[PDB]
Amino acid sequence: EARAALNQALEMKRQGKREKAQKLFMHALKMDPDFVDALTEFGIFSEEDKDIIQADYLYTRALTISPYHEKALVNRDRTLPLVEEIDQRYFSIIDSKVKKVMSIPKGNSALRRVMEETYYHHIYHTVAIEGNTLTLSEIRHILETRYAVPGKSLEEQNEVIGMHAAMKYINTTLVSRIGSVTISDVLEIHRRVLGYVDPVEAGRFRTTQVLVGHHIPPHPQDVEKQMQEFVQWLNSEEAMNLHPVEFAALAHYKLVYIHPFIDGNGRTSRLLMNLILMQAGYPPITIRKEQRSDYYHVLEAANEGDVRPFIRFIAKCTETTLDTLLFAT
Amino acid sequence: SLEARAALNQALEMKRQGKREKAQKLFMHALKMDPDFVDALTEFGIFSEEDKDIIQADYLYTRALTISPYHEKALVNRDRTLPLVEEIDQRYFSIIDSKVKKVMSIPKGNSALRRVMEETYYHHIYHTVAIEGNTLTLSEIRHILETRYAVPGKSLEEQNEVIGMHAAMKYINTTLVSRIGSVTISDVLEIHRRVLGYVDPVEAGRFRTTQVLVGHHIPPHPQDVEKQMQEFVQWLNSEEAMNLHPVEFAALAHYKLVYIHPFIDGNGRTSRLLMNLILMQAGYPPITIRKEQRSDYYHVLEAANEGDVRPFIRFIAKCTETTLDTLLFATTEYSVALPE
Ligand SMILES: Nc1ncnc2c1ncn2[C@@H]1O[C@H](COP(=O)(O)OP(=O)(O)OP(=O)(O)O)[C@@H](O)[C@H]1O
Ligand SMILES: Nc1ncnc2c1ncn2[C@@H]1O[C@H](COP(=O)(O)OP(=O)(O)OP(=O)(O)O)[C@@H](O)[C@H]1O
């Protein structure tokens, strides 16, 4: 019961429980996730395994519940600047790999092959996370030939066509264009993303209220005003001062939070993310299909107070993209 | 100008000696060299009445007078045939009206009618997409709409045309048919938005921005298209249009939209749908311009552009009859062949 599982895990730490300590710490927070002592003690336990980022999260969560909790505050005050350095140090590692892909001359036969294949790779994964059953070979066939695939839903194949049209529009019209991003530009991306599936709802705002896991987004009445504030933030001086990868990740989150469409919210958000990156001089990033579980958890964590685990998750995806380019080239 | 005044005379002397088929071919060749040859129209009009073809004869005389108003030989013939054709045409609408009453006489929930009304829905889709060069079969179009799975080795654009139509008819049958009040420019765009939405979601429900050729027809410039549609919907809701016979009003509404050609694509499909909305609002079943009538469908549209729209109005009335003939036949066929 309450305050029971922690002590079991805490005495196990003295013994050297190893996995047995962790399992009980996880079970203790399963019964009560707002148990301030279980967070602080599991935070201390995390630093023993050199996991300072996880520890800082647990302390920050504990203080959001109990601001004046001494044991958590004295630990956070130490880790707060330490993590800020670790995070900034990770962005500088990414910035060096981004410079190493720009160092490669345009016209390289190796890069052309990768940039081509990774375009289809991005489409496969962005549709696969939302439960599209089409393979990479099938998605290649759809876009190359424009003939339908045997024994597969027309809705699934129109999702693929919708994405290709949306990226073509971005890469052509938006990426290079001078000036601010408008509410019109966001609708125009969605109009292509969902146009071939639902031509009625494509490029028009959500009219009904919906549940997204455990997230209840703004009411259709408010959605319009939420988007006017969102585009104002995108063009704000504050947002320009942020590191591209962070600004991209925050732009992503704020759109999936507002959830202004009946469908294509995740897809439009992942596209808008890449527009921010490509406008700042970063290649298009792919949140892979197998990262669906993680992708949601960091979005859950973002809703409850701390957005950083999401910002880090995007930066990790950014690195794996850059790693794939430099390797394949 | 006597390039084919020898071809007329050639055909005319052939008529005297008999030369039934030989006369026609030369009359057709005479109008091929000069289609605005007033004597070739009037003489071929006289020739037509000999085969009891008064409708064709009246067309030729009316065409001749549009070129040469005061041409005596044509005028004396037209003055006779003008009221005669008006009677023949009105008599055809009364034949249709009796067959429309005979489909309403059939009970509301008849099991035989339900089967036909279902099959003819897919039949209408097959033909409306087939005329514009869609290669999908009837069985394939049934599979698309029933299962919502794609067809092997056929373009996604062709299959999205089928989905676009089904959505457009569903919207019409549900929202528009039963709705009280006037038809608006918004309603026309909303039909097109579904018709073309699954193929071209960008241009769906938005007016033509560029100028295009349609066979030998140059439609109003994109600048004027908006005003042409405001006058079109004003005519649709006008008292004059309500006084016209449903089949004529349907056919004229069809023509005026394909004339204006206010979209990049889906002009014919939107027109054929709007036609059926007029008919169904007046209490007529949805009519199908079949795929094999593509050649005829264009000729009567050409004929309409040059002055006389009646051949089109008659072409729609003929399609209306063949629809009603198919329903009454199949319904009586199934009544015996099905249980109940
Ligand atoms: N708890 C959450 N809070 C906020 N956003 C979330 C949450 N879980 C998932 N999301 C985001 O919203 C999407 C889920 O929305 P939903 O399930 O309605 O749409 P989908 O069909 O999965 O994808 P799409 O929005 O691309 O059509 C995810 O793809 C993700 O980007
Ligand atoms: N000479 C003509 N004058 C007026 N309208 C014509 C003429 N020829 C064809 N049309 C109309 O235009 C339609 C064909 O237009 P067009 O060839 O641009 O489109 P499509 O792709 O064949 O068909 P849709 O309009 O259904 O997409 C015909 O169905 C008819 O309604």
Numbering used by the authors:
A (entry chain A): 105 to 433
B (entry chain B): 103 to 442
Source paper text:
Dimeric wild‐type FICD binds ATP (without magnesium) in an AMPylation‐incompetent mode. (i) The wild‐type dimer FICD structure displays a lack of density corresponding to a Mg2+ ion. As noted in other Fic AMPylases, this Mg2+ was coordinated by the α‐ and β‐phosphates of ATP/AMPPNP and Asp367 of the Fic motif (Xiao et al, 2010; Bunney et al, 2014; Khater & Mohanty, 2015b). Interestingly, in the dimeric wild‐type FICD:ATP structure, crystallised in the presence of MgATP, there was no density that could be attributed to Mg2+ (Fig 5B(i)). The only possible candidate for Mg2+ in this structure was a water density, located between all three phosphates, that fell in the Fic motif's anion hole—a position incompatible with Mg2+ coordination (Zheng et al, 2017). As previously observed in other ATP‐bound Fic proteins that possess an inhibitory glutamate, the nucleotide in FICD:ATP was in an AMPylation non‐competent conformation (Engel et al, 2012; Goepfert et al, 2013) that is unable to coordinate Mg2+: an essential cation for FICD‐mediated AMPylation (Ham et al, 2014). Moreover, the position of the ATP α‐phosphate precludes in‐line nucleophilic attack (by the hydroxyl group of BiP's Thr518) due to the proximity of the Fic domain flap residue Val316. (i) The mode of ATP binding in wild‐type dimeric FICD sterically occludes the nucleophilic attack required for AMPylation. Note, His363 of FICD:ATP is in a non‐optimal flip state to facilitate general base catalysis. By contrast, dimeric wild‐type FICD is never able to bind MgATP competently, either in solution or in crystallo, due to its unperturbed allosteric dimer relay and consequently inflexible Glu234.
